[PDB]
Amino acid sequence: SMSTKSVLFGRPVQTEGVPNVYAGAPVVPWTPPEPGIDNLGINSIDTFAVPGVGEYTVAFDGWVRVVRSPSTSGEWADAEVYTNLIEMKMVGECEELGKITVTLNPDCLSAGQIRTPFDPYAGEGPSAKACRMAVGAIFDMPKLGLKLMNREPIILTIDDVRSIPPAGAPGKGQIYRMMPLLDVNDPDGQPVAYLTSLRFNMGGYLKPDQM
Amino acid sequence: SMSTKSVLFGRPVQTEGVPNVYAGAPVVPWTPPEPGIDNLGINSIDTFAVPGVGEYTVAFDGWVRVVRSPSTSGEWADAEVYTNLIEMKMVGECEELGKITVTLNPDCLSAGQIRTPFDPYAGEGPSAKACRMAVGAIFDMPKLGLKLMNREPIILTIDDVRSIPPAGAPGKGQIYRMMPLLDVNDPDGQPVAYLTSLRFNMGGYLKPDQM
Ligand SMILES: CCCCCCCCCCCCCCCC(=O)O
Numbered sequence: 001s002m003s004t005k006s007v008l009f010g011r012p013v014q015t016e017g018v019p020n021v022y023a024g025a026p027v028v029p030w031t032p033p034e035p036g037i038d039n040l041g042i043n044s045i046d047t048f049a050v051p052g053v054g055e056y057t058v059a060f061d062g063w064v065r066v067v068r069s070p071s072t073s074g075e076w077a078d079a080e081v082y083t084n085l086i087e088m089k090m091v092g093e094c095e096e097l098g099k100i101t102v103t104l105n106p107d108c109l110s111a112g113q114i115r116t117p118f119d120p121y122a123g124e125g126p127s128a129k130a131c132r133m134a135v136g137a138i139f140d141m142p143k144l145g146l147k148l149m150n151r152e153p154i155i156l157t158i159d160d161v162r163s164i165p166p167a168g169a170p171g172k173g174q175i176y177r178m179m180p181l182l183d184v185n186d187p188d189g190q191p192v193a194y195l196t197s198l199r200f201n202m203g204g205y206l207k208p209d210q211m
Numbered sequence: 212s213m214s215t216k217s218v219l220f221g222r223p224v225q226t227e228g229v230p231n232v233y234a235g236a237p238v239v240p241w242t243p244p245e246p247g248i249d250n251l252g253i254n255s256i257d258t259f260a261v262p263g264v265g266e267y268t269v270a271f272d273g274w275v276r277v278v279r280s281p282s283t284s285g286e287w288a289d290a291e292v293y294t295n296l297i298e299m300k301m302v303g304e305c306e307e308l309g310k311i312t313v314t315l316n317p318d319c320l321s322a323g324q325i326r327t328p329f330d331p332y333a334g335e336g337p338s339a340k341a342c343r344m345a346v347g348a349i350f351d352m353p354k355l356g357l358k359l360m361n362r363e364p365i366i367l368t369i370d371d372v373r374s375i376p377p378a379g380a381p382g383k384g385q386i387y388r389m390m391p392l393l394d395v396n397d398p399d400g401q402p403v404a405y406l407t408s409l410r411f412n413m414g415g416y417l418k419p420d421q422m
């Protein structure tokens with residue numbers, strides 16, 4: 001494999017020789033872009049269930065860096081783009097759980113793709129694409145003295161994709177009822193908590209000093 | 212991890228010394244069972260999208276072997292059970308795709324759990340549990356000269372669980388729009404096909420010679 005990661009959640013994408021894209025760069029709709037690493041803002045709302053203890057909803061803000069493969073075509077209708085999520089930092093705060101910092105698990109390749117869906121029956125603009133990303137994350141919860149991780153990838157989706165990157169777009173975590181979160185120090189143990197829902201919005205390109 | 216597999220989709224469960232359970236063994240509702248390996252029938256209906264070629268719906272029949280951990284309690288309400296899917300074989304056939312045989316990917320630990328949901332549905336009541344399994348599979352398609360595998364786990368769920376095992380129960384694959392299926396001989400390549408939907412039914416205990 002082209003990846004050194006121990007667990008791959010999708011297709012590896014090269015970053016060497018791929019330029020970073022920052023604020024100032026246009027987002028042109030319906031246009032397959034040249035390969036780049038998108039430096040993008042993001043916010044989310046995450047709900048966590050702690051068995052026998054409680055359920056907590058936490059708002060997060062931060063950024064992601066996502067490398068894109070070259071498009072498989074210069075024509076939008078045929079174009080596919082493969083992505084890797086290569087760096088993240090999101091922060092949120094909560095009285096009960098403290099300050100939570102979400103980053104990537106270095107043992108996992110977080111990977112996704114953008115392509116025409118097989119079920120274009122959702123009211124999306126004509127020709128719009130579907131974006132997905134499968135993520136291995138770390139949830140640092142210092143107030144609880146814990147760091148948590150997921151073995152099952154968190155599936156994050158953006159529908160009605162009319163530009164790449166889909167700046168400004170709303171997305172969802174596809175979690176059916178519960179997603180186990182494991183103590184990094186006891187990953188073969190019982191889950192410590194469950195992520196029960198996640199919604200997010202993409203922002204736009206950031207300046208380097210905003211990260 | 213105590214599991215030697217390179218990709219872990221959940222919690223490992225002990226199999227050594229755990230007896231097999233076969234037809235004849237009763238399934239009494241509301242009763243956490245002693246640890247065992249359930250030998251169960253199963254059927255499913257799977258839809259596959261092959262880009263630029265077609266979409267095909269195929270019915271499968273076969274069996275699964277699922278090991279259960281000891282229950283965390285002898286009282287149903289408190290009981291949780293952890294599971295691993297340790298062996299399977301399902302077969303279906305389709306003119307365009309040929310005979311398809313589904314087995315486990317030996318590199319992946321397929322793992323799940325049964326516990327009370329945090330969000331019980333109106334038709335579940337406060338006593339029913341929810342069952343989930345995260346699966347790494349192989350799809351053998353000799354007609355096409357290919358074997359395919361998934362990197363994102365196939366999330367298989369059963370709601371309104373009132374017995375363990377949930378013999379006879381309907382279940383669903385929680386696949387959002389598309390699940391990439393990769394050539395085992397080109398696993399970092401573009402997907403060959405996508406699993407776009409899956410539903411299944413659990414059968415009951417099988418005789419040893421029915422597998
Ligand atoms: C545990 C919470 C994780 C949230 C992390 C956000 C996931 C990434 C956002 C959705 C996919 C991003 C797609 C951008 C693709 C592109 O750069 O063109």
Ligand SMILES: CCCCCCCCCCCCCCCC(=O)O
Pocket residue numbers: 249253255275277278279294296299313323342343344346348365367375376377382411
């Ligand atoms: C293409 C993938 C097909 C996979 C088919 C799913 C196999 C059945 C697993 C569903 C959960 C099993 C629950 C049984 C639990 C128990 O033994 O008590």
